[model samples]
Each structure stands twice: as structure tokens, then as C-alpha cells.
Target chain A: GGGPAKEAIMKPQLTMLKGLSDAELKALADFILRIAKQAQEKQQQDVAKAIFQQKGCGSCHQANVDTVGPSLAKIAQAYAGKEDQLIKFLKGELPETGGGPAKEAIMKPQLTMLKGLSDAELKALADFILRIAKQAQEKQQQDVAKAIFQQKGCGSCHQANVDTVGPSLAKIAQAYAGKEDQLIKFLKGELPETGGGPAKEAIMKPQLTMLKGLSDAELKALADFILRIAKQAQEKQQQDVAKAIFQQKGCGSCHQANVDTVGPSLAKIAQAYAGKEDQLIKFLKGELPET
Target chain B: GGGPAKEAIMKPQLTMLKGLSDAELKALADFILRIAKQAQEKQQQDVAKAIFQQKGCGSCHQANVDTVGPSLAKIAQAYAGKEDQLIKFLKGELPETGGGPAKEAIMKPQLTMLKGLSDAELKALADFILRIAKQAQEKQQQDVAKAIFQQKGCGSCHQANVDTVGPSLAKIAQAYAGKEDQLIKFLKGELPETGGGPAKEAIMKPQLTMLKGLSDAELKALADFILRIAKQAQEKQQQDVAKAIFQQKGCGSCHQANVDTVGPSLAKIAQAYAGKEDQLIKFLKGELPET
Candidate 1:
């Protein structure tokens, strides 16, 4: 019945592919259909997101944090693998299921606005909600990973600068720097990219068990936390070096707080040398003396 | 001019002492003076207590429990040896001292009433307050003793009926029962009243170090706590035996509820045998099978 419209639409495309073989024409037609389908899907998603914003659903519901309603992540989790149910519920054709009737009541008033939406429109909104939820979950996993790192007492054996019972976090950070996937593999008890000797790997084997079942995002966060230790340790080492310099130079013996057994106290020295590190260094080297 | 009036007032007393010797009269006079002094002191204390209650101090400042104001015990502790200072404070001659100026605001209005009190009355009130504080402190030490008992992990080594790493609390309680002084001495590591054999004493000798430096009241409270354990153990043992009988009789196998395996649940049995321990005992003995 629409043969005339089909021929009219295909007239320009047939001329563009007039010199192509039959098989090439068929492949080109399939590619065009795929691109059209993707464009339509993108348009649908954009419209759904706009509707979500315009309806003020974002006022009481956040993607990550709980506001007047549960977070999108919580909704996503409850509705995970239940997309059809979520679509039905969004269309207001079915009772709410995720957070139960109590949570549903808060959204019940908004159901009227959603009821007139087409099935495909509802699906797009549901998909957007699930996507927000998935993103929130990944973020939460990262936070949980940091807590797990602390709770497992991983710091006991690991140091940032110097190795103790196991390799220092600094060494691990350096070895796995910019290689998050490899670090994750190590955490998952897979082969190390750094070629850690068996002896060192054996010591870390038991610790990896604690990291088992962690999500990819969590492993990334844990690796990042470990890498942070190196930076902190470097800063601490600078302080330690200053302390060592003081003790080694015998500044602690004669120049201490409140008392000047042999020389001026450190507090007095600090007061005199305030903002004059260059002069202080010269004084330490005996190139400068009291003015 | 009042000398004759004084003599006239004394005449009734002299008539009553008509049969008494000079020594007896002197003794009677001394007794009357002593009674007068005591009566004055009691009157002062009663007045002080009345003032304390009349000013609604009890609503905010309890003898022990803290309310809006610090408890009497805390006040007493802060002013323990400073009764003169307390009197000065009551007279509004000094700012609040214990919880400092911040806490002083709540009591600022109350100081106006205190300022109206006579010096003698303020002294009486201060003395009464100091007395309350002393008593509250002693009570606090007893409560602190119970806390220390738990904090020191005394329960782990000393069960009521069973001995584990150390002697049972009941054993120590029984041995030191009624001999509070000796118990205190033992806690202080002075001497054992029960003539502890050297071997048993050696095992317990290290534990007493934990009790070292406790205040006299604290030591007494700890001693009393130890003594109370035996009485508690005896009472608890009766209940434990009843529980043990249930488990030992295999009643847990069939009649566990909130669960059902073989026979009716414990709730059903309890319902059928409610208020009839004699009948329950008969059923336990197999005289009465399930109906």
C-alpha cells in the first residue's frame, strides 16, 4: 500500500549505489538501518532525561544521595534484572516493588504525570534510572574499598617508604603506577605484572584473600589509596629527616624547651631565627653566629 | 541589769536539783550546755536542707544523678576540702569554680537567693553540701568498682560456678564472705584472710597488682562486689540447673520453637502445661506422653 512512498524514499539511495554490487548494496542498507536505530534510541533517551528533569523528580530524588526519597542507586538495585517490572511500575500499571509501599507512597502522587507516557518512553526513563543507580553503586564501592583497606589492617605490614613484613606500599605504588588493571589483577590473586618473586608474593597471598569479591571499582579505589600512601610517606620522611638533623647536630642536647643548660633553648632559637632558615643553616654550619 | 532575770530563770533548774551534790549539779549544767549546742547544730542542718529543697535545687541538682546542673557529688568533689570557699561561693563572693564560667550561667539566677542568706546560714548550707558530696563520692567509688571489675576482664578468668584460668568468683566470695576488712586487705595485697596456700596465691598475686592504688572506698566496694558474687552464684546456679535439665532431657530435639521437627513446639507444651509444674515434671519423667 505504501509502495510509492518506499520507491520515493529509495530513489536517491538507489542512484548513489548504482555502481555497487548487489552484496555491497545489501551491506550498505543494513549499516544505514543500524545508524537510524541508534539515532532514534539516543533521541528517546534525551527526551526521557528531559522529562525526568522537567517533572521535578530530581528535586526529591538524587542519583547518589538520599533526599526525600531513596537514592537512584537503591531503586536501581531493587529493580535490577526486573526492567520489565520497572517499566510497568513507571507506567503506573503495577504496584511499586523496590522500596515497598511506604517508599512508593512518596512517588504515588507523580504517577499520574507518568501514566500518559508510551511504553517505549517508560522504558527509556527506567533505563536512565537504572544507569544512574549503576553509577552510584560504583561510587559507593570505591568508598567501601577504602574502609575495607583500613579494617583489614593492611597498614600493619605495609609501609609507604620502607619495606617491613611485606613490600612497602610505595614500592607497590611505584611498580603498579598508572597500571590500575594490573593492580586489580594482583588484588584478585592473578599473576603480577611486576614479576614479584615467589617469596614476596607468598607473603601477600593471604592479604589478597581479603580483597577477594571486591568489585572492579573497589579494586581501583584500593589501589589509589595504596598509591596515596607513597606521597604521604615522602612528606613524613622529610619531617623525619629534619628531626634527625636536629638530633645529629646535637641541637637537642643544649638547646631544648625552656632550659639553656649549655646554650640557648630551641624555643629562643626558633624565635630569633623565625622566617630566617637561610641564616639558621649558616649558623648550623658556623658561617654565621649570633648578631 | 539582766543578771537577776538570768538568775530567776536558773531558779527552776536549781529546785529540780535540790537533792544533787555540787559535782552532780556541775554535771547537769555541763549536760544542758552540750544538749543546747547539739540542738543548735541540728537546727542549722535542718534549715540548710530546707533551703536546698525550697529553691528548686533538687530539680536541677540531684544528690547523685546529673540533671541540668552538675550532681551534688561533682560539686562535693570540687569543694571537698574547700568548705570555706564553698561558703564564699554561696554568698556570691566567688564565681562558680567546678564546671567553669560556661556552666556557671545556669546557676547565675540561683546565686541571687544565696546572696540574701546570712553568713552563718551560708556556712551551714556549705557544710551540708560538703557532707552530701562526701557521701555521694563514696557511692560513686562503689559504682566505679563495678565498672573496673568488668573493664579488667575479671569475668573471663573468674566464672561464678566454674573455674577457668583463675579461681571462680564464688570461691573467692565464699572464702572472704563477711570478712570485709580482710577482703580489703587482700585486695590491697597486704595479707590473705583464708590462709591462701602459696601456689594458689602466686597465681592470684599478679591479678592483685591490677587492684593496687585503689582508694579505701574503692577497695571496700571491690571487696563487697567479690563477696556478693557467691550469693549471686548460688541463686544463678538454681536457674542454670533448670536450663541444663531441659537441654539434657533431649526436649530441644522435638519441641523447639519457634520451630517444629518431631513433636509439638515448646510453646504448645508450655500452653498445655501452663501453671502446672507438677504436671510438667510428670511429663518430663515420661509418665504423661503426648495426648
Candidate 2:
């Protein structure tokens, strides 16, 4: 304890129980045991969370939304007020009765790992999972927009970027930029200022009827989603244009990055022409041909 | 040479090469060599046919009609007058072409086995394969009726046995049995004696116009195929009825084959019931109930 490294070790805080009555000693012992149990529960919960991450449970099962498996919130709801049933599931003691056949087939293999866990550990895991129901309920407001987009079949014809039967979501978002009110009005069956052309409007007229069922908050969420998708699409479009320009310049035939063929490597050229856009442009234009 | 087994092996007709001058002997040697090579070619062709059957090539590839791969005739036509190229394909030296991407993917692995074959073996295999064009041409007469049935959408509405969109082919064949002339008359746009009722006639009416374009030989072929399929369907239906009756009886509740459950097995029952159909009927009617 007197060594320099001993300072790094943490010693638990304590009080002396000397000169106490028998009744007071009993009370003190109970209080200390409760605190120690609370610490142990916390440590077990932390271990379970680590296991969840290490086994890639998050890859398929989300806290709020359904992915490969049902969301944790869904499972929590199915076993609500019956935490013992959830523990039974982890122990592989319960027959699968919730998800349909294909989903149950996927979930059965994951329970094999949980079968080896101790009863206390399983209970801690169950408590950790049950908490997701409350978390999911809180996130419902944020998820409504995406739910509306998918559930109403908007994704069938309108992808985020590329056009299909209708113009892309990015194109629609750009057309309705800075005009969320007008976009909302369009969803209510009012004609848009710029989005769909006359030909496209005819095809989309019946589709707009579907948007009439959504709430005000849901409409706002959908508009926000479209705008966000557009922002990502614009960045992607710029990258595509840069790639096409690179291929068209004929630089690929002679110069590649990191290695030379018939001419200097792109790395060598970049080193020579760094911060010299004017010289590079002049060389490309043949105003300054290679010597 | 005089033994019975040697005589059996020496079944080829005798030849003479006696009393010849040196020049005549040289000519005879050349002639004998030519005959020997011809015999070798014939033997190799037989070997190729045996290999084709032993390898179960017909399981996925037919001589005339396309299956999993293109028909042998299609392959032969694709490599026409290019026997060396066919050999190259078997040897895995040629790049895959002709058949589409997915078809080539399936064919690629099959070619791995052919890669071990000798050049002479590959050439003989190619020769055997190239002959399928002539064989397919001969089978065109037999295929025309089935091809017409499929291409004209008859098979889509009327299946071979069970009814789909319309009555089964067996039903139509049974209705037109012993009346090929009337069937031909229907093909010539005259209404049949009894096939489609008024409801089905509307759907079949437009389809008969397709038959109007077909030649008399094609009509005859179609009628013959329909009758053949009906014959097989009737046989299958009888077996199905027998199975249904066996299951419907309460005899299955007490009796099982190979082992006794609550009563004697089916094998024992069959032994007792043989040549006793009247007694079995009496027992079934309770006229001889457990006496």
C-alpha cells in the first residue's frame, strides 16, 4: 500500500461498526448487502451489453426498428410483465411462438450462445432488453416520416437519386426546396409550383390521393427526409461527374497513381503540379505540351 | 486360332493378301491401313455415344429441344463447318460464346471434365456431336405439334391432366375420342361436337383461329398427342382412386402394414382377403360383424 503504484488502486469507502447495539448492527449489515448487490447487478448489465455488441446482435436486431430480427421493443412488448418468460427464451426452455416461421428459424440459432449464461446473467440481460420498449416509445416521433414513406409505397417508383417510373426523390426535393408549405399543400391535392410536369402530373395525380391520409407531423417528417436525401444525392452526383471527367481526359492510358507505365505516375505528376492548377490546365489544353 | 473363343473373337469376314509383287504389297498395305482407320473411327463414334449416355447428358440436354443447356443440334449449328473449334471448346481452349451468360455459367463446370480428354478423343466427340443437326432435322416432324401447343398458349389454359384456366387436355381428348375428323373440322374453324361449353367456347374460339393457320399434318399430330396424354392420365386417375378408397375406409384406424397396431397388419389382411371380395364386402356391411 506504501508503494507508488498503490496510489492507482481504489480502496472502497467504509465506516467502523464499533460500539453499536445488536439492532443497529443488523440494520447496517442489511444496508451494506443491498449496496453490494446493486453494484453486482450493474456489473452484470455491463457484461451483457458487451456480449450484445461482441456477438453482432445490433447488426440484425435494433433497439427501436425491425431489421433482420424483430426490434428489442417488440420482444419486450411480447414478454411484458413476464420477465421470467424472456429468461426462459434465453435458456432455450420456451418453444418459439411469436415471429412467423422464417423469422423464428433465424432467431433459434442466436439462442444457442445464451443457453450457457448463468441465471443471474440471463435476468440482467432480460432487464437490459426490456428497457428498449421505453426507448422505442420515445423515438416514435422521429420515425414517423420514414414509416410513412415506406408504408405508402413511395419507394416503389421514387428512389433517393435515380429516376424510375417517376422522378427521383432528390429531384422532387430540389424542386420543392425552401417551400415546405407548398409541398404540404401538394400532399393535400393542391398542384405544386414546379415538381411534376403535366405528363408526370397525370401519372402522379392518383398517388397524391394516398398522401391525404397522413397527419401534419408525418407530412413534415416526409419533407425533411426528402431534403436530406437530396443533400446526399448532390454530393454523390459531384463525385460521379469528377469520375467521368477523369476517364475522358485520356490520362488513364499513360498515367496511373503510384506506378509508371509510358509516362509519369499520377503521384509524381501531382507532386510536381501541386498548387499549380494554371499549369495543369495549360498542359491539358496543349498550350504547354510535354517536352 | 482354332479354339471356340478365338473363333468367336474372329467374327470379321476373311481377307487375302497372297501372291503379291512388292509394288502390289505396298498398295495392299496402304489399302489395309485405310480400312483399319475407318474401323477405328466407327469404334470411336460408338464410344462417344456410350460416354454420352453414361454421363447422363440427356438429363439436362436433349438432342432436338432445349433443356437446361441449348440442344445438341443448336450447339452443332453454332459450330457448323468448324469441327476444330468444337474440339477446342471440349478442350477448354475456346472462350464461351453463342449461349447467353447464365447458360455459359452452367456449361463452364461441365467442360472441366472434358479438359482431360485427348485431342483425338475430343475430335471424335466433336464429330459425334456435330451429327445431331441431322438428327434434330429428322425430329422436327415429331416436335411441331407440342411446339404449336406451347407457342399458341393452349398449354397455359389447359394442362395435361388437371384443369387450370380451362378443362384438362384429357377431358378434351376424351370428348373428341374416335372423332379425329371432327377434331380436324374444329381446327378448320367448324365448332366441335362436344369440347368447350359456351363459357369456355369464348376463350377457345380466338385460340381456334391460331389452329386455322396450321397444316393438316399438324392438326393430326396435335390430336394424336392429346389422345396419348389422355391415355396416361386415365391410368394415373385409376391409381389415385384406389389409394383414396384405401385411406377412406376405417380399416386404417386398426391396421398398419409391417407391424400390428390394434389389429392384424395389411399384409396379413391382404393374404386373408385374396380371392374373397364377397366376404370382404359382407364384413364391410356388418353382415358378418366380428362373429
Candidate 3:
């Protein structure tokens, strides 16, 4: 603390907080930070994506379709959990691992396109590409789980949205909410079947024996597929189009759903402006202001 | 072909051809077409050879003799009529077949790599393995000297015919001439560095320590291999030296090998100077007039 190095350490200016109450200062600081980070959240991939398009990677690769290159969906699906491997291949560290229809010879020169990119830039590029396949990868996992369910004849009773013989996936998902480990154990025949009607449970108990042979990875996917239904329904019930618009605009950075910062908590704001919807709407649109 | 489809009808900006070039578009936009094809018996072996290389089976199994693993020739020879059983071996269904000079343990793990290969691919690999004995017969029966040279990694510095980091095998063979025993002693580090100038000597002294581990028979074989190449390599080296001198002096800029332009062809000069070496030498040195 006595040397020149001591000067490197910094404390924020204190005068800004002096005139405000502790809670108000905390809210103000939090609001400023949230707004400061809003810009970054809005389009974190813009720079990385621009590089991809500029490098003629777009010439061969299309957004969702295959052109000269494999579709981004397939690339993402193939490298689902192996993004580091994809990055290594992009860096030319993996010269022999082949994929899709493109010859390794053609890829050799294209890999040099990223040879000069900094590691951070390369990571950003990889992240942007992997995100393209995120939805598809999730859907594919659900499909695989569904197929296994059908193949084992589990679909004979349990349905997607309704119960015919046993409880529906939604009911099962609801029952097993936030307890995926227990669900996996039940699938693996490690736990007793105790849900649904006794008659249905008796029939489903034998069916659960079929899932006992599933690999650990398959069991996890099955659990995820079962759990995803409840989460999907919950999202639809809890989040409205307004919430979607809010998040899409990254307004949550400064005014999170229930958290208070510079702006009051969403709940607090709702109570304060219950009958002043028109006035609040104008304020939100910037047509009316405190100035 | 076929009068260009009876006419172009004036090429317009067709919506279907917007993607790929006209040539590629023709193949696809016209219709989905597949050419009729049949498998060839011999082509299957070619495909098998490709699998061998692509799978790196050649890394351990050399074309002829045993290397790190058994030779392809011997493997093919052993599987002559026993080819039916080799399929199970590759698929890892037959887990116990052990092979290789390095341990069957290594081969066991490597064989598992082909576990995911298609039946056709496995057959191709098997066919390639069983048919290699023919090519093995064409190889030199005894290449102990060459094998030992490779085993000791001598080619990293001394290439066969061309001088690399150190003397070429041809140069070293010529230098050793009749002193084969002395060459052996030098290899065993029993003698001081003698040839290829001081620069290479300093570089070679440390490398000679690796050869000190070689047995008497291996050293003898290595020396024999070097000395055997001496006579044939000497004649070839003379031609190579002459070519280097000719290229260095830019004689080929005017006097080409066969074609005559402003200067006579090299063949023409050789034809006329055949019986008069001294006269040609004098003429070349500008000591005599052209007449």
C-alpha cells in the first residue's frame, strides 16, 4: 500500500452517495450497472457474427440450410457437447477429424481464415455458431427420448397432454418437477413406481423395467424430455408477450421483473400505477417524461 | 450434347437457378437423377486399400515386412481362407485374437476404433488385409540394413540419395568406400568425426550416441547397406553433380536438353563431341575457335 503499486487500487467516488439514503444509493448504483450492461446483452454476438459473414464463411454456410457446407444445425448437433473439439478443429489443431460432406482438403485452407484471430475472438465465433443449433439440439433430444418411449411401448398408456392408460407426460413432468435425479432412478428401476392410479401404476411398473437397460446418457435425456414439458407450459402460463418484448429489448438489465434498482420493483411500479396505465404507457414510450 | 436441349430459348433470370452455378443447377434443378451403378470385384479391393490408409492400419503394419505390428503381407497370408473369422475380430465380437510385436493389448484398443464401422466398411478392410501378401512378395527379401537404419531414425538427417542436414547415404557410402570396418567403429563412436566438414560433425557427435546401443550384427548390416550403394550411387552422384553445375551456370537457359534454339541442344553437343573429349573441353574453355 506504500509503493507506486498502491496507486493502482481504486475506490469509487463517495460524494454521489452522500446525499442519498443507503437503499436509494444501492438502487441507483444497481440501475446504472444494469443499463451499462444492457448494451452488451442486446447483441453480444454482433462482432463475432460480422467476422463470420465477412470471412466468406457465409458463402458456404447458410443460417439454417445447407449450401456448400453442412447446415449450421447439423454442425451444432454433431458438436453438441464437444464445442472445444470444434474450436480445436477450427484452429487447425485437429487435422484428421472429418465431418459431413466437405473434404478435409477444402477445410484446410478455410481454417487458416481464423489462424490470425485472437483466442477470445475465436471463442466468441464458436459460441455464436453453437447458439445457432441450441434449439434444434434440444428438439432432437426430445425426439430421441420420445422415440425410446414409443419403442418400449410406454406410449400405449401415457400420452403427451392427456392420460389414457397411465398419467400424461405433463402430469409426470409436474410430479417430477425439480427432481430429475429421482425420475432417472425410477426409470432405471432403482425406485418403486408410486404415482398415478394404483391400476395404472401396476401396468406402468412392468413398462418401467424396459427402461432399466438404458445408458446413463439416455436416462438423462429421458428425464430432461419429461421435465421439459412442465417447464414449457410454465413459461407460457407465467410469461406474457409483454415479458418477451421486455427481455428482447434487454430492459430487464435495468428493471428486472421484481428487483428494485433506480426504477421501483416491477411489483411496486404495478401498485403505484394501477389506474394510471395510460400515463405509464406514455412514460414508457418516452412521450411523457419527468422533464 | 444433343443440340443443347434443342435450344436455350433465350437464357433468362430463372428463379430455380438462382443458387449454385448453371452447371451444378442443371444437375439438380432439372430433376433428381441417380446413375445406375454396379460393384466391381476388383474395385472392392481398391476401396479396401483406401480404408487401410484412412484408418491408419499402415502405421503399424508395413506393406511387406513386420514393423511395429505384423506386416500386411503376413496378416493377409494368415487370413487366407480364415477371412470369415476376421470380420468378427474387427467388429470386436471376437475379442480374444491377439497380434503385434508390441502387445496385443495395444491392438485390442485400436480394433475397438472400428466398432462403429459399417459391415461393408469392415469387409473392405478385411479384403484389403487378406490380399496384401502378393505385394509383399515383390519387396526385397532382406532389408535388415534399411530396416535397422529406419529403426534408428538415421533418415532424419541422412536422406537416401540427396544430402539433407548431414551427408546423404550415397555420399557417406562413397566416403566410407573400402573402409567398412572403420565406418562401423565411427558409428559405434569408437573413432573421431572424419568427413562431411566440421559443421555436420558437431551436429553428428551427439546423434552418434544413439547408435552406440546397436549390436555388432546391426552395425555390420548398416555398414553393408551403405557400402553396397557406393558404386551405383557414385555414378548417379556424378550425373547429379554435373546437373547441379549446369543449372548453377544457367547453361540450360540457352542449351536445353533436347530442343535447339539460339544454342545447340545438349544431345547435339554430346553427339558431335563423342570422340573428341579434349577438343570439346578446350572449346568449352574458350581456348579454341568454333571452326
Candidate 4:
């Protein structure tokens, strides 16, 4: 038992159960688990994926833990044990808790996701969640993850960043480049030494969590996310630059469109915006200090 | 205790726990139960009061259940009793179960919910769930609700009517005029004898919760919903009729009518259309016959 590391001290793998002679039972269990999970995830993901596609979930949600929408991980966490409730919500029965869907407006387009599935399918999907939840419970991934965040004092100034109070998680992820490990190290009171300029963590010292309870994996994930966010932030900065050029150059004076915003007409911009539209670029970039 | 139905007691009111010395705990417990159940309620009225609100949860969620948001009920059920994992999720450390929020979208917004809570608050919220779950374990509201929908074969020819599927809860509620008791009879497969012809329970019998598993309370709630939808539908229908007159009159034949047709250009109509315009209504009614 005295191994060099605790995980190394003892190893218990599902492969250990392979020696069991109940292949049928194992297969059935496996099928039940695999099918059920697929069904459930499919069911849940169907609506979300369709919403992503139809409602432009890509504009928001991503597959990873972080994105415009809360990552599927967060959703799974929210609805992990409650497939029916999730279903109910998909059916437009329950209200969304976090700022994910607007029941009357945006959620409609994605409702088609639940179409065609029978009760058996729904039940299979529910079983999938049960299996995953059961396994997740045994795995304690959520706990380990939370501990990592808590240890890093993520809640001090930073939040989970959905839609609640602070900057959205997507905004952060978009802000950072998805380099979670570096973010984790920063959380550990290390500095982001990549020379990306004055580190945000430095300014964020008051917001940093105390490195107390995180396990290695959690710390690492958190770091990875921070890095990821950094990359995103960098990309966003570029986009912002583009937007600024458009706005500062009087782009808004003519071309104004889009439901959530008002701005220069993208209609003309799109005519050549894709193929380097260098003319427009100069047109926008011609900084007129005093026209 | 000696009341007529005393011997038929199935369960006690959740509020009865207040009699215990730990009233605050009991209150929290009650609140937890209400919030959890309300999370799944058919009423959008409580849409604003989900556990997210209790915890100021909208920081992360879209604030609307149907949107790209995670509801507290969804979260509680997902991670029920799995507080550590929940924390991991909050920290952006957990892997996704492929259903709910993306990781990046939640980290910052979710922290607001967690920021003020002490460890005990987290535990209390978690523990409160456990107690409610235990209490709910013996209850069948979820099952009963599902059964009610199934008995109706809500999936048959007709879908859940959530706009993405069927009409929509709002649409349905508006159809029934908001008569709670009448709506209950409809669920019971018994049309109100007073509303119109013979009790159309025969027509609706097939949709009755298969064999009447819905409690009286549940049936009433469902009916109330239907009535409200019916009424709303009626109102919309009237509006549509009025609009039809405008459409038929060739109003849009010129001005890009925005009111009910293409005739009245929105910009032109905007000044006159105060959402009322009684004189315009009289003019529309005069033209209604042609449509």
C-alpha cells in the first residue's frame, strides 16, 4: 500500500471486473449503460445541439466545460440527476434557472430537438443520466473540480460566469485563450510569465483564490481553462479591433443591422468583407484625426 | 385528528415541520422543497422564483429556463447530494455530462452565487436538497405528472404543444379561458356540462391520465393552465380577426402596412398605432366582411 503516490498506492480499474464470467450480464449492463447514456445525452444534446444549430448555439455554447453557453459539463452538473426535470424544461414545462434560455423567445426554435422520441427513448435517456450520475458520484469529478476552484478562491471576484452577476464564463473564456493550466498556476499564486504583457492575474490578485483544497487534476483543469480564456480574450481583442475600426471609421453612420445591436450596415460589408475587403479595410482604417 | 378524512391520511403538510424546535432549518427545508418543486411546475409565474433566484443564480443562467440556461431544479437534481462534484462544476474542473452548461460560460457568473455563501451555506443548500429528496422519494408528483401527460398520449398526433412541439403552454392556457375547475374536468375526460354541449369527456377520455393517476390537486392545476391558455388563445384569435380585415382590405398593397398587413407601412402606421386606436378598430370592423 505504501506506493510513491496515493493514486499509485492502489489501482482499481473496471478491467478488474472483466474476469467475471457473467458476460451476458456484463454486456447487458454495459449496453444499458452505454445505450442509456447515449440516449439520455442524445436526448439532452439533441435539444441543445439543435438549439446550437438552429438558434446558433455556436454563437454561445461549446462542447467543452466553458463556452458562450455554459459548457455541457455545467449543464450536466445542473441536470445530472434530474433528467425528467430537464425533459420537462425541454417540453417548456419548467423555467430555466441560469441564464441559458428565454422560455418564450429563444427556446422555441430548439424545442424541435425533443421531437420524435418515444417514451422508451426518453426512458432510455433517463437511464443514461442515472448511470452517468451514479458513475459520476463514484468518480467524484464534480467534488474534485469544485475543490480546485474553491482552493483557488475562484468565487472571490470570479464567478462561474454563466449569466448571473459577474462577467460571463464565455466572456472570460473568450477573453483568455483556453490555457487552463497556466490559469491554475496563476491561481496558485504563480504569475503568468508568458510575457503576454502585464498579467491579468497580477491585477486579479484580490480576486485569486487561496490554494488550499485543490487536487492536482482540478488545479490543472482550472489552469487550462484560464489559458483557454486568455486565448479567447486575445481573439476577442482582435474582433474588437475590427469592430472598433468599423465604428470609429463611421461604419455605423450607414450600415446598421442585427437584432441585438445597432451598427453599420453589414449588408454592404458582407459583399466583400469575406475576401480581405482591403478597400473597406483602408476605408475603415483611414483614421481621420480631424476630418 | 378525527376529521372525516383523518384515517385516509397519506402525508402531512411539509410546513408541519415548523412545529419542531429547529424552525429555521425547517423553514429552509420548506423553502428548499418549494423551490425544487416549483422549479418543475407548469406555471411560468414562478419562473422568476427558482433556486437560482434564492441564490441570485441568474448571474450565470439566461434567467429564462427555456433559453441556454440551467435551472436550479435542474442543477439540484443533476448533482443531488453530490455537493463536492457540484463544487467541482462550479470551479470549472468537472468534465461535462453532455447536457447542461458549458464550462467556460459558467465559471465567472456562477461564482456570484457561490461568492457570498459560506461553506455551511453550500452544505446547507446541499443538505436541504437531501432532505427534500428524501421527502420527495415517497412522493410521486413527478411520476404523476408524467403519467398524466402519457395517459393523454401527449406524444400522439399531438406533441407537448411547447411551440416547438405543439401549440405552447401559453397558447393552450389562453384557449381555455383560465377556468381552473373546468380545465380539471377536461383532464378528467369530463367536459363541463355548462360550458357547451354534453360533457365532452368522451372525446377527451383517451387523453385522461390513462387511468386517473392525477390527484385532484394536480388535475385542477392542469385545468387552470388550460383555461388560461384558452383565454389567451381567444384574445389572440380576436386580434387576428381584426388584423385579417386589414389584410383583406389591401392595406399592404402599397405602404408596407405593419399593423396586420403589408398595406400600412410600419413607419407610417407607427404614429397612429398606439396599440389601441379605437377609431381604427371601427374602420377595421366595417371592412371585416370583405375579408
User: Which parts of model 1 have CA positions greater than 4 angstroms off?
Assistant: A1-33, A98-102, A135-182, A185-291, B1-291
What lDDT does model 1 reach?
0.65
lDDT of each: 0.65, 0.64, 0.63, 0.45
How does candidate 2 fare on TM-score? 0.21
Candidate with top lDDT is 1
Local accuracy of candidate 2 as per-residue lDDT tens digits, B11-47? 2211222233444433322322233344456778887
TM-score of each: 0.24, 0.21, 0.25, 0.20
lDDT of 1 by residue, A165-189 (tens): 9778888888877666567667788
Error of 4 at B275 (Å): 6.9
* Docking quality band of candidate 1, CAPRI definitions: incorrect
Clash count for each candidate, listed in order shown? 0, 0, 0, 136
Which portions of model 3 show Cα errors greater than 4 Å? Answer: A1-126, A129-139, A146-182, A188-190, A195-197, A206-217, A240-291, B1-291
Give lDDT: candidate 4, residue B127: 46
Question: Residue A134 in model 1: shift from native, Å?
Answer: 2.1
Please give, for residues A1-291, the per-residue lDDT of candidate 4 as tens digits: 223453231222222233333433333222222332344456664553343455354455443436545554566678764675666665555677567445345545565665666655555444443344344443465455556656655655555434433455565565545445345566676764444345553555555455556567666655555434444554555445545443444434434532112322354334333332322222232321111
> What is model 3's C-alpha RMSD?
31.7
